[PDB]
């Protein structure tokens, strides 16, 4: 009968239903030997004294993946380097092929594996400069924006992706310049522009030290990173 020997074509086919690609996700900077795929679920036995299949990896660019044929397990090979999703490495995904050769009949099937690398909040906000400065005239009206120096990557940036990499700025109380957080304000935390909120008086106070903290927007408040800088504001007479 036709198709009596279709059993010999079974090896190398998926032992599961579902779509052909096998897609998984793991955290960036996962440790060497981290499991990527527990079981490829391919029919047949690789390795041992009487295998029905040969398994191996193709298009394993930079050798990120290691295969254990007997378990049909894929592992991260990260020794002496880190799986980094952030600039400059920018690895968002690893795609490899598991080649399976059916020993009995000689057919080859390629099983595609996509590994999606998930972003960690492993980077803090970073200020382009060690400190910032503004000069303001004494008759500046209250409500005037007196500092915009964080505009256009000149302030804090964070190399992480999404909210892990979005910044908010807030003014903190300065116990060595107590009135500075009362005299200046950041009403729009996303821009970090500082506005004057009390009338200045050059005859009384000529310099303010405004402590400004940038934070990122990680989902978990306990995983947020922060960094502080100082804005020194000098009054001018002319």
């Amino acid at each position: 009968m036709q198709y009596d020997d279709d059993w010999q074509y079974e090896d190398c086919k998926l032992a599961r239903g579902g779509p052909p690609a096998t897609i998984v996700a793991i955290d960036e900077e996962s440790r060497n030997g981290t499991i990527l795929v527990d079981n490829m679920l391919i029919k047949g036995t690789a390795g041992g004294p009487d295998p029905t299949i040969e398994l191996s990896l193709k298009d394993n660019v930079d050798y990120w993946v290691l295969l254990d044929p007997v378990k049909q397990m894929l592992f991260l090979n990260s020794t002496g380097r880190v799986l980094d999703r952030d600039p400059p490495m920018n690895i968002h995904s690893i795609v490899v092929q598991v080649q399976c050769v059916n020993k009995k009949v000689g057919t080859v099937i390629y099983h595609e594996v996509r590994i999606v690398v998930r972003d960690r909040n492993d980077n803090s906000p970073t200020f382009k400069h060690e400190s910032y400065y503004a000069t303001v005239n004494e008759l500046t009206p209250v409500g005037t924006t007196i500092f915009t120096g964080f505009s256009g990557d000149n302030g804090a940036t964070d190399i992480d992706d999404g909210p892990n990499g979005q910044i908010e700025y807030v003014i903190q109380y300065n116990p060595e310049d107590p009135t500075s957080n009362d005299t200046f304000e950041i009403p729009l935390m996303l821009t970090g522009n500082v506005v004057l909120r009390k009338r200045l008086n050059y005859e009384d106070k000529t310099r303010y030290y405004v402590i400004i903290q940038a934070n990122d927007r990680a989902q978990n408040l306990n995983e947020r990173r922060t960094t502080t800088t100082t804005l020194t504001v000098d009054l001018e007479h002319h």
Binding site: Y9, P20, A21, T107, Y110, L188
Partner: protein, 206 residues
């Protein structure tokens, strides 16, 4: 006075990816965008940017994303798509990688046609005389090709994996001078195998 707070997406797929099978019918929902706003503002969703917006539409009030034209994994197997949400004072956008899932929707295509070969009457049993090859761009078993004669021939066989054609019985010119055989190349998809036919002319010389 409270300054406006901009809205933020909450879907967890933005942290990983979104899988959509290439056999999703046009008009079908693929996901729903979700967002919140500390001011309790009512939110309007969109898909800005030209390429993404040719494949994906979004119902502005609900965030239901739907498919505007067919996906084809063999043509384009992934998208990076920016979605937007707006509280009527600002817009924020955020990107997600969309992976297009494969289904077996191609039959194999043969290489180096047309197929014809002249062989001597005294060609010994076992002799390889011809090699057929076909490829198939679907993934997995849907991309792995098997060859056969339809129907099988008492005089020629074809290796199901390698497409090597051999003589398996002594030929005889006076009985048959030429054979027209049909070669079938099929993929190995479980539920919907697809296949293709080519002719192979075998001319026996005296």
């Amino acid at each position: 006075m409270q300054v406006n707070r901009l809205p933020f997406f909450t879907n967890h797929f933005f942290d990983t990816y979104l899988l959509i099978s290439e056999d999703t019918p046009v008009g079908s929902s693929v996901t729903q965008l979700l967002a919140r706003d500390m001011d309790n503002d009512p939110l309007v969703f969109g898909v800005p940017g030209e390429e993404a917006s040719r494949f994906f539409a979004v119902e502005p009030d609900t965030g239901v994303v739907w498919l505007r034209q067919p996906l084809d994994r063999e043509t384009k197997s992934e998208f990076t798509v920016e979605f937007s949400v707006s509280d009527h004072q600002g817009v924020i956008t955020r990107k997600v990688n969309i992976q297009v899932g494969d289904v077996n929707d191609n039959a194999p295509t043969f290489h180096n046609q047309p197929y014809s070969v002249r062989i001597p009457e005294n060609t010994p049993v076992g002799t390889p005389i011809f090699i057929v090859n076909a490829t198939d761009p679907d993934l997995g078993a849907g991309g792995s090709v098997l060859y056969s004669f339809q129907p099988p021939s008492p005089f020629f066989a074809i290796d199901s994996a390698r497409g090597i054609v051999t003589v398996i019985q002594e030929l005889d010119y006076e009985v048959t001078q030429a054979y027209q055989l049909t070669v079938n190349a099929t993929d190995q998809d479980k539920t919907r195998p697809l296949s293709t036919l080519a002719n192979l002319a075998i001319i026996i010389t005296d």
